[PDB]
Scaffold this active site. Structure first.
Site, mmCIF file in Angstrom:
data_model
loop_
_atom_site.group_PDB
_atom_site.id
_atom_site.type_symbol
_atom_site.label_atom_id
_atom_site.label_comp_id
_atom_site.label_asym_id
_atom_site.label_seq_id
_atom_site.Cartn_x
_atom_site.Cartn_y
_atom_site.Cartn_z
ATOM 1 N N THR A 1 38.470 -2.507 26.981
ATOM 2 C CA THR A 1 39.280 -2.049 28.004
ATOM 3 C C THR A 1 39.841 -3.221 28.331
ATOM 4 O OG1 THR A 1 37.939 -1.980 29.859
ATOM 5 C CG2 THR A 1 38.053 -0.145 28.671
ATOM 6 N N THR A 2 41.335 -3.120 28.950
ATOM 7 C CA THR A 2 42.236 -4.189 29.271
ATOM 8 C C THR A 2 41.687 -4.723 30.826
ATOM 9 O OG1 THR A 2 44.003 -2.969 28.444
ATOM 10 C CG2 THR A 2 44.730 -5.008 29.715
#
Ligand SMILES: [Cl-]
Ligand SMILES: [Mg+2]
Lengths: 240, 195, 250, 241, 244, 231, 111, 235, 243
Positions: free
Chosen positions: I30-31
């Site tokens: 995920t970012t």
């Protein structure tokens, strides 16, 4: 320290290193054990591709573990020295703590346990050796003969053979040994042992070793002439 | 423990060792054999700290018996004595040293000669015609200096030994309850039952 | 983590060869030529200084090294491997000899210790053999002058004269024609320079050649006076100027 | 072919892992250069900051090992910093054990020995870096000593490292053929830095702004790096001549 | 991990053989031949140096024959560096026995222990075995003169006459032919040299390619002497038997 | 394929296959369910037998008076990890006189599993765990995976056909979360949840295993005739 | 020199009946001639209907009680919630005490 | 090669799965649990007639209240029995009581997975552990090299296991007497054995609360064999 | 070939393929981002809501080291936790010996050397995380990003994960439009916007926003989580910008 698991299972449930150690035993010179009514006799083959040998100093095939127990073997010679040494040390250790020499069963159980340990320890290969262990328990006149093998299993035998062409001499012993009436005397027991080796050996000259163990630490090795007399007698009865 | 003696004569070594085991104000036993057979022609007597003596004697016995089985051969008395000395020489600089003094009487079959070795707990070895450990020596050495001859028979050696026990029984403070006498010669080890 | 390589990396092949040792010898073959000649009153060891760049200062890189005051070493093969062997060789001369006997080891025994180190790299776990051959020249009171070769296997041989590396085959043949048992040290230096010119291609002077001797004691190189028994090192590295002087009468 | 995976010999007597570690050296695509003056030793290296989000002050391949020793690295930054931390520790220990500052050449040998071990021992890989050590030694004077993944080391009159190293090397060779001496015959370190940048410009054929370069200078009793404005001041001096 | 690069030096073949031991013996078969002959009044040790160069220093050299103590020596066939590791262990072992018992070590005991070390390298540790075969020649007051051999497997046997290294098959046949029990030392010297001269891979057997040694009771009264032959002494004994 | 020999090896797409194979052992395991309200937390587990002559493999293990888990996969691995949790809960009590937070319990299990995925010689744990507990911040339910990933949830399920119960709980979320101060109803919801994962077999008396912990309830397990109430 | 032991005084008493048992103890805790606490309990319910007191050096006493209480906890974990009988508790406490034979817990223990 | 502690793509440990194949090659062992006791029986299977069969020891005492039968690589069982006996006696030393049969089994099964790169491989032997304690009464456990153990009313292991287990499924009920169980083990052993069953190539044993663990004599088993043959002929 | 099967093996290029394979695991994650500001740093991360059954606000991913350093990472979450555990040990021993809390550059190298050590041997696996971290020390604010190879630099802004390119582009605009500097409270709002904009690259599952910050003025130089009114205010700012 070197850790590699050398003895492991294969898909079919075999431990190949243990099984290949049995092949080393099959290559070794033949060894036979026969127990009579009042004795046990250990017979051993010696290959005759080696002339110019010095038999005074060359390691004998049958080794005393204590004054009342003996050990013969088939397989790798160098491996057998390690087992014999350990057994001899345990024999003295047992006398020290229990104040009584080992039973043949106990000594066999120890040697077998050592062999088993080398089949599931890291960094080691199994012993390429099977043993015949014979003798008499302290203050006992009942003959004892045991066998061990690389896997670690051990068992008692009325008569048994190991090494090359052992399946041939086992065949001989299976029909020539009566459980109801074992060889009543020393002479009878030695003769049956020599007969069984003569099925496989070649010449009855300096190829056969015989060691007789009797009760109360009475162990003696036969000489060439003594063995040669059994060889001469058996052949004359054969021509019939 | 306390009294251990040794005399080497023409054809044999004779060891005499006291029978008493005392703890506190009680003689717990009066028939104690303070000796171990190391090999058929080698005998070791011992005296010293309680527990240590037997533990050391049996440990040496086990090692010599192991050697005998391995080589199918009997070590010479000289060889056995040197092995024992080294063990005591190691021991003295350990965390807890063996406090044991020994005499080693043997018959060398290759030389056809009797041999007597005296070794203390420090690892101090000497070959002697006669030996003793503890306070015994303060009486017996002078006595033997006078009466001992190198060409004596076993019977003459036993009479010479009786003379030592008599002196000790007269002048020693403690009751050591007599001795067990053993002879080491060409035919091995045997015990004198009536002493 | 931790060194999991506790097993041998050098093993016997079906034909009986030890692969890594053979391959190490191949690395030595690629190496620059070095040689050693034994005279009656001394020993000479020599080699070419192969410069990696003309900007590099070849004086800072020493191929001929002092091990003890009376022992020196030169090599052919992998330089870094040689450098660490000289470190270990210098130390073992102290730990396993000088700190025990209060004197420096004789040539044969120091050689024996270096050979042991190189043998262990052939059998121990998780290591390759050393990729060098050594030529060790030295003197000691009871053996006199001596010259030894040490190979990656750990084997060592004593030599009257020999060469190792690139053009060793031709160099050995040259030395067989010129060597006799009556050679004086100066005659041996002369033959060393002649033998080396054959294998060198580019410049041939005191800056491209490295040469040292084991000869007479040098009291001027001792660094102190007052002890009669201490007379100075027999090992001496010839200067750039000293080499050029001998190249004129060549 | 497992002889190419670990540091054991190949049939032709080579160590491929060592050779491939040399190729990792150029992975950053940066060229470095080192020269000696009368009183000083100057080292310069290219500074390429491609990402706009990077903090340019933290991007560096020059390291202050001790007060007197500086080191520039050609190779990936993780292995570079690994070498730097070890060198710093070794230099500190040397001073404590032996009572004087570790010389540049001795540190170079020590780091080279460590690198040699990785070429012989299997469990340790070589570091993919080339280490250039610079100082003004109190015995040997201005000094440049360089280490590689093979464990090789040697002193230099001058040196260069990187993808376009050969162009820089010959450029310097040709100057020392002309000048007939082992160094830059100049009094101030400022003009030795100017020489270094000038000859890098000629060899590479590129112009440099203040942020395209990184400069380290070693004088007696200290090694220091230059700021952007120190380099800009230096660039202006070259342009006005 | 590192499993990938493990040769597994201490395993069995499907046939029940030890790969590395077999390959080590194959290595030893290319080494210079060494012969041992036991007579009633002494023992001979003879060995052939591996292809010599004329610039090799012959007198200050040792390759084949090594001294373990005053009563025991060995002849080497295989890697010299490997043999020296084992020789130093054997030398130390002999001194340990002498320190413990105040008696010189019996020959077999020393042989067994050195052979036990070799065995260990075949069963555990994951290391390559020692590529060496020994001929032991020695004397003690139990068995008198004795010849033994050990090989990388750690197996040892006793002999009246034996060869190791190259051309053992041919060498053993020749020894088996001319050897007899009542033989003397001087006769054994001649047999040893004659055998090497016929089995050699060289053109002609010369003094510079040989190492020679005897263990006699030829000292003065009831004591044993070791004689490692000098170059000139080998030159003379080679002329005396009419080989050169 | 070539990158699944050991845990120390990454695949070209950045996967750890030995960890994924360990995850597969959980999928073969018998279904177990976890759910909670604000007052109580409940574990429900379907037990599995070898045959009709055998016993039913126990799925639920107590860790402390206020904490415990259910297992799916290699049972011996659950014994090792639960034993570790018992020790950590116990260390917290003896040293700090403090009941171990259910969140810290999760963090500790994560870090223990992780070390087995980055070193040569070892292997990943081959079991999944559902940890329930009641501490100073109320009721809790955690899901442990042997990859190291630990997750706090209102409800969940792991094992074979666990997707049925997981969907049911996702629908029932608003209902069962507000079952406060009523144990028997929270269990009923969990028993109905696990029923969505049954095929051909139904919940019997020596087949079902239930556990509960809450505000005024120590971690206790129910088997045999004590679960007959809920069939 | 540092002395690792102290004396916290107090006294305890246990009597057994036909279908019951009591374990009493005073609540005073002291060092030398000073009172540390007028109410510091040293008789504890350890679970499984076992009460315990370890009187003497309070630090050792608390340590022992703490370890035995923990022993009862692990006895349940390891043996399927089986009740620890008083005879089994006694034998377990012997091993706890003797385990420090050469640096003893300075307490008289009664359960 | 590959790691010893490696998982297969199906989520099983290779070495554990392979050891289970070794156990299938072993000699048959059967156990039946009743309210009057637990019976343990084994096939001896001598490899040759010269071998003295009474030296074949595949039924073994752990304590007075716990017995054990084995099948597979029987040499591997020695250290397992040694551990079991020590665990049983040690618990009695620490707690002055008999150790629970389940707790004993769990202690043995803890050894199982202690292998890797600890021992070099799993055990190649399965155990049937039978015993009695005051809490849970007469119990029978099957201990595998996976580290897992199941309690059983009846269980067969070895070469003839799957056939014998199906037979035990039909024959077992909760009211079996000890005598009924003895005959049932003999009956099922005779069915799956290669050679003809007699007192020399098969061995019986039991554990009861009153008399503890007992291995039967060859004379006692011989009569039960004769009693079994007569009862099958009687209808 | 086979050069990629073992860690610490150089390929003929001079590359360690095992490290490059670990980077693929990071890209899959995920970012997460980091923004450097006037007197501190701000951290933010995307938390994918896999199911309704996930308890909101209760699966915290951002981690504190000491009392002044924050750490966030993308990729294998357990690997990141292992790295932070080491970071906490490193920071503890520094403070033990030297008294002062560990400076950010000093802390950065401690992690760097540790991660680099996991590229030196075949018996260990490289880290499957890129870690963004930083804080405030005596010399002001510092932001760092560390990769599986052990490589790290200082950053004005940093991003990693599945939506790194989207986030990087948005970060570059802030650097250009604010040369004088960005305030702490502004950076929190911008961090929210960038996570929402970077969520376009992971838009199947909806997500939960998590922010933290260190500031000399706003948080007194200590690491704190952004919660309640300040979080909702930052969420609303982000919601207004996507529409
Ligand atoms: Cl160094
Ligand atoms: Mg004395």
């Amino acid at each position: 320290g070197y850790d590699r698991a050398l003895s492991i299972f294969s898909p079919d449930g075999h431990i190949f290193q243990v099984e290949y150690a049995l092949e080393a035993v099959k290559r070794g010179t033949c060894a036979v054990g026969v127990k009579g009514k009042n004795c046990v006799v250990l017979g051993c083959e010696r290959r005759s591709t080696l002339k110019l040998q010095d038999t005074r100093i060359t390691p004998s095939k049958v080794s005393k573990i204590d004054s009342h127990v003996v050990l013969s073997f088939s397989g790798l010679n160098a491996d057998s020295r390690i087992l014999i040494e350990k057994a001899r040390v345990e024999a003295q250790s047992h006398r020290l703590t229990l104040e009584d020499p080992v039973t043949v069963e106990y000594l066999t159980r120890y040697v077998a346990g050592v062999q088993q340990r080398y089949t599931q320890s890291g960094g080691v290969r199994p012993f390429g050796v099977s043993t015949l262990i014979a003798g008499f328990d302290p203050r006992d006149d009942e003959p004892k003969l045991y066998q061990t093998e690389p896997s670690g299993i051990y068992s008692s035998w009325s008569a048994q053979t190991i090494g090359r062409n052992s399946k041939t001499v086992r065949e001989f012993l299976e029909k020539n040994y009566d459980r109801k009436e074992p060889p009543a005397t020393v002479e009878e027991c030695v003769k049956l042992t020599v007969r069984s080796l003569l099925e496989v050996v070649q010449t009855g000259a300096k190829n056969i070793e015989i060691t007789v163990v009797k009760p109360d630490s009475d162990i003696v090795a036969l000489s060439s002439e003594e063995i040669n007399q059994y060889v001469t007698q058996i052949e004359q009865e054969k021509q019939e | 423990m306390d009294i251990i003696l040794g005399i080497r004569v023409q054809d044999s070594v004779i060891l005499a060792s006291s029978k008493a085991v005392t703890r506190g104000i009680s003689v717990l036993k009066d028939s104690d054999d303070k000796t171990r057979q190391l090999s058929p022609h080698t005998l070791m007597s011992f005296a010293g700290e309680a527990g240590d003596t037997v533990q050391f004697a049996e440990y040496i016995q086990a090692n010599i018996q192991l050697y005998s089985i391995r080589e199918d051969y009997e070590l010479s008395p000289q060889a056995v004595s040197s092995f024992v000395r080294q063990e005591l020489a190691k021991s003295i600089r350990s965390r807890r040293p063996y406090q044991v003094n020994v005499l080693i009487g043997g018959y060398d079959k290759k030389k056809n000669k009797p041999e007597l070795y005296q070794i203390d707990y420090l690892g101090t070895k000497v070959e002697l015609p006669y030996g003793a450990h503890g306070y015994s020596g303060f009486y017996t050495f002078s006595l033997l200096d006078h009466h001992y001859r190198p060409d004596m028979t076993t019977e003459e050696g036993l009479d010479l030994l009786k003379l030592c026990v008599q002196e000790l029984e007269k002048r020693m403070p403690m009751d050591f309850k007599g001795v067990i006498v053993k002879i080491v010669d060409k035919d091995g080890i045997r015990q004198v039952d009536d002493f | 983590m931790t060194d999991r390589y506790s097993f041998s990396l050098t093993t016997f092949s079906p034909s009986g060869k030890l692969g890594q040792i053979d391959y190490a010898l191949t690395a030595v073959k690629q190496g620059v030529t070095s040689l050693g000649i034994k005279a009656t009153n001394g020993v000479v060891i020599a080699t070419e200084k192969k410069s990696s760049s003309p900007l590099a200062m070849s004086e800072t890189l020493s191929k001929v090294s002092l091990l003890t005051p009376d022992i020196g070493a030169v090599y052919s093969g992998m330089g870094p491997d040689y450098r660490v062997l000289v470190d270990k060789s210098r130390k073992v001369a102290h730990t396993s000899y000088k700190r025990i006997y209060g004197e420096y080891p004789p040539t044969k025994l120091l050689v024996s210790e270096v050979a042991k180190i190189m043998q262990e790299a052939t059998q121990s776990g998780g290591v390759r053999p050393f990729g060098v051959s050594l030529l060790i020249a030295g003197h000691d009171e009871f053996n006199g002058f001596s010259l030894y070769q040490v190979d990656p296997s750990g084997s060592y041989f004593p030599w009257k004269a020999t060469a190792i590396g690139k053009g060793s085959v031709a160099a050995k043949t040259f030395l067989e024609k010129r060597w006799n048992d009556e050679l004086e040290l100066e005659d041996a230096i002369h033959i060393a320079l002649l033998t080396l010119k054959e294998s060198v291609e580019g410049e041939f002077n005191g800056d491209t050649i490295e040469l040292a001797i084991i000869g007479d004691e040098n009291p001027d190189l001792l660094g102190y006076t007052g002890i009669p028994t201490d007379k100075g090192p027999r090992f001496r590295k010839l200067t750039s100027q000293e080499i050029n002087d001998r190249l004129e009468a060549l | 072919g497992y002889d190419r995976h670990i540091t054991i010999f190949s049939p032709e007597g080579r160590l491929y892992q060592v050779e491939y570690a040399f190729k990792a050296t150029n992975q950053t695509n940066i060229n470095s250069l080192a020269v000696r003056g009368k009183d000083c030793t100057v080292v310069i290296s290219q500074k390429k900051v491609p990402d706009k989000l990077l903090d340019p002050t933290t991007v560096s391949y020059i390291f202050c090992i001790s007060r007197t020793i500086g080191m520039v690295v050609n190779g990936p930054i993780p292995d570079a910093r690994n070498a730097a931390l070890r060198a710093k520790a070794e230099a500190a220990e040397f001073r404590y054990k032996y009572g004087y500052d570790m010389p540049c050449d001795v540190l170079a040998k020590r780091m080279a020995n460590l690198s040699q071990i990785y070429t012989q021992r299997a469990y340790m890989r070589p570091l993919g870096v080339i280490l250039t050590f610079v100082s003004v030694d109190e015995e040997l004077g201005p000094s440049i000593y360089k280490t590689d993944p093979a464990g090789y080391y040697v002193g230099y009159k001058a040196t260069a490292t990187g993808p376009k190293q050969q162009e820089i090397t010959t450029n310097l060779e040709n100057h020392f053929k002309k000048s007939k001496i082992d160094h830059i015959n100049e009094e101030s370190w400022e003009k030795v830095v100017e020489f270094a940048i000038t000859h890098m410009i000629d060899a590479l054929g590129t112009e440099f702004s203040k942020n395209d370069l990184e400069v380290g200078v070693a004088t007696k009793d200290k090694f220091f790096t230059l700021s952007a404005e120190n380099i800009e001041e230096r660039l202006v001096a070259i342009a006005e001549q | 991990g590192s499993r990938r690069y493990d040769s597994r030096t201490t395993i069995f073949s499907p046939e029940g053989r030890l790969y590395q031991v077999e390959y080590a013996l194959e290595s030893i078969s290319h080494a210079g031949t060494a012969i041992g002959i036991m007579a009633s009044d002494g023992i001979v040790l003879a060995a052939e140096r591996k292809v010599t160069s004329t610039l090799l220093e012959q007198d200050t050299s040792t390759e084949k024959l090594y001294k373990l103590n005053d009563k025991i020596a060995v002849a080497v066939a295989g890697l010299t560096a490997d043999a020296e590791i084992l020789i130093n262990t054997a030398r130390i072992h002999a001194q340990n026995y002498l320190k413990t018992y105040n008696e010189d070590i019996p020959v077999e005991i020393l042989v067994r222990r050195l052979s036990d070390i070799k065995q260990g390298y075949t069963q555990h540790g994951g290391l390559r075995p020692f590529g060496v075969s020994f001929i032991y020649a020695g004397y003690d007051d139990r068995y008198g003169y004795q010849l033994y051999t050990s090989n990388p497997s750690g197996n040892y046997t006793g002999w009246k006459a034996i060869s190791v290294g190259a051309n053992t098959s041919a060498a053993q046949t020749l020894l088996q032919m001319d050897y007899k029990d009542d033989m003397k030392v001087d006769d054994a010297i001649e047999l040893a040299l004659k055998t090497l001269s016929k089995t050699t891979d060289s053109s002609a057997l010369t003094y510079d390619r040989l190492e020679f040694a005897t263990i006699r009771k030829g000292a003065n009264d009831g004591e044993v002497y070791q004689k490692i032959f000098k170059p000139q002494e080998i030159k003379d004994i080679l002329v005396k038997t009419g080989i050169t | 394929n070539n990158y699944d020999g050991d845990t120390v090896t990454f695949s070209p797409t950045g996967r750890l296959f030995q960890v994924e194979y360990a995850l597969e052992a959980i999928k073969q395991g018998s279904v177990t369910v976890g759910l909670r309200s604000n007052t109580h937390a409940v574990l429900v587990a379907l037990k599995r037998n070898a045959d009709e002559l055998s016993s039913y493999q126990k799925k639920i293990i107590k860790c402390d008076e206020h904490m415990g888990l259910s297992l799916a996969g290699l049972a011996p691995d659950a014994r090792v990890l639960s034993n570790y949790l018992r020790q950590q809960c116990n260390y917290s009590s003896l040293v700090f006189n403090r009941k171990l937070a259910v969140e810290r319990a999760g963090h500790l299990l994560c870090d223990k599993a992780q070390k087995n995925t980055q070193s040569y010689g070892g292997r990943p744990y081959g079991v999944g765990l559902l940890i329930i507990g009641y501490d100073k911040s109320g009721a809790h339910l955690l899901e442990f995976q042997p990859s190291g990933n630990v997750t706090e949830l209102y409800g969940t399920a792991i094992g074979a056909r666990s997707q049925g119960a997981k969907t049911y709980l996702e629908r029932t979320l608003d209902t069962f979360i507000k079952i406060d101060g009523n144990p028997d109803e929270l269990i009923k919801a969990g028993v109905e949840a696990i029923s969505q994962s049954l095929r051909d077999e139904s919940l019997t008396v020596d087949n079902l295993s239930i556990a509960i912990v809450g505000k005024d309830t120590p971690f206790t397990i129910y088997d045999g005739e004590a679960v007959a109430k809920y069939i | 020199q540092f002395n690792p032991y102290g004396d916290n005084g107090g006294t305890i008493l246990g009597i057994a009946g036909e279908d019951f048992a009591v374990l009493a103890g005073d609540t005073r805790n002291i060092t030398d001639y000073s009172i540390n606490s007028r109410y510091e309990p040293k008789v504890f319910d350890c679970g499984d209907n076992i009460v315990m007191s370890a009187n003497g050096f309070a630090a050792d006493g608390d340590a022992l009680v703490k370890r035995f209480k923990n022993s009862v906890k692990w006895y349940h974990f390891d043996h399927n919630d089986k009740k620890l009988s008083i005879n089994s508790a006694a034998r377990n406490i012997q091993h706890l005490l003797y385990g420090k034979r050469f640096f003893p817990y300075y307490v008289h223990t009664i359960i | 090669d590959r790691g010893v502690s490696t998982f297969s793509p199906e989520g099983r440990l290779f070495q554990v799965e392979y050891s289970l194949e070794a156990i299938k090659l072993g000699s048959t062992a059967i156990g039946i649990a009743t309210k009057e006791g637990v019976v343990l029986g084994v096939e001896k299977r001598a490899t040759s007639p010269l071998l003295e069969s009474d030296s074949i020891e595949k039924i073994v005492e752990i304590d007075r209240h716990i017995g054990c039968a084995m099948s597979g690589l029987t040499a591997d069982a020695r250290s397992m029995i040694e551990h079991a006996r020590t665990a049983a006696v040690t618990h009695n030393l620490y707690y002055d009581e008999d150790i629970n049969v389940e707790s004993l089994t769990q202690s043995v099964c803890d050894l199982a997975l202690r292998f890797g790169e600890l021992m070099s491989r799993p055990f190649g032997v399965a155990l049937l552990i039978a015993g009695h304690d005051a809490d849970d009464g007469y119990q029978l456990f099957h201990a595998e090299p996976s580290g897992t153990f199941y309690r059983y009313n009846a269980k067969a292991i070895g070469s003839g296991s799957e056939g014998a287990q199906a037979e035990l499924l039909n024959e077992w009920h909760s009211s079996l007497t000890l005598k009924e169980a003895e005959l049932l083990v003999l009956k099922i052993l005779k069915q799956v054995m290669e050679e003809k069953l007699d007192e020399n190539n098969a061995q019986l044993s039991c554990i009861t609360k009153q008399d503890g663990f007992k291995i039967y004599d060859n004379e006692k088993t011989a009569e039960l064999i004769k009693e079994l043959k007569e009862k099958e002929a009687a209808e | 070939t086979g050069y990629d099967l073992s860690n610490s093996v150089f390929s003929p290029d001079g590359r360690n393929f095992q490290v490059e394979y670990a980077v693929k695991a990071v890209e899959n994650g995920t970012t997460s981002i980091g923004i450097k500001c006037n007197d501190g740093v701000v951290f933010a991360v995307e938390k994918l809501i896999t199911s309704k059954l996930l308890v909101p606000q209760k699966n915290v991913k951002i981690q504190v080291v000491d009392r002044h350093i924050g750490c966030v990472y993308s990729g294998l979450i357990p690997d990141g936790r292992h790295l932070v555990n080491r970071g906490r040990e490193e920071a503890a021993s520094f403070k033990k010996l030297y008294k002062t809390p560990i400076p950010i550059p000093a802390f950065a190298d401690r992690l760097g050397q540790y991660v680099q050590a996991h590229t030196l041997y075949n018996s260990v696996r490289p880290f499957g995380v890129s870690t963004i971290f930083g804080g405030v020390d005596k010399n002001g604010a510092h932001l760092y990003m560390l990769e599986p190879s052990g490589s790290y630099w200082g950053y004005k802004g940093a991003a990693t994960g599945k939506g790194r390119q989207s986030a990087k582009a948005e970060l570059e605009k802030l650097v250009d439009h604010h040369p004088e500097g960005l305030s702490a409270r502004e950076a929190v709002k911008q961090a929210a916007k960038i996570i929402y904009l970077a969520h376009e690259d992971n838009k199947e599952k909806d997500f939960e926003l998590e922010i933290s910050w260190c500031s000399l003025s706003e948080t007194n130089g200590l690491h704190k989580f952004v919660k309640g009114d300040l979080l909702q205010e930052a969420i609303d700012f982000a919601q207004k910008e996507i529409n």
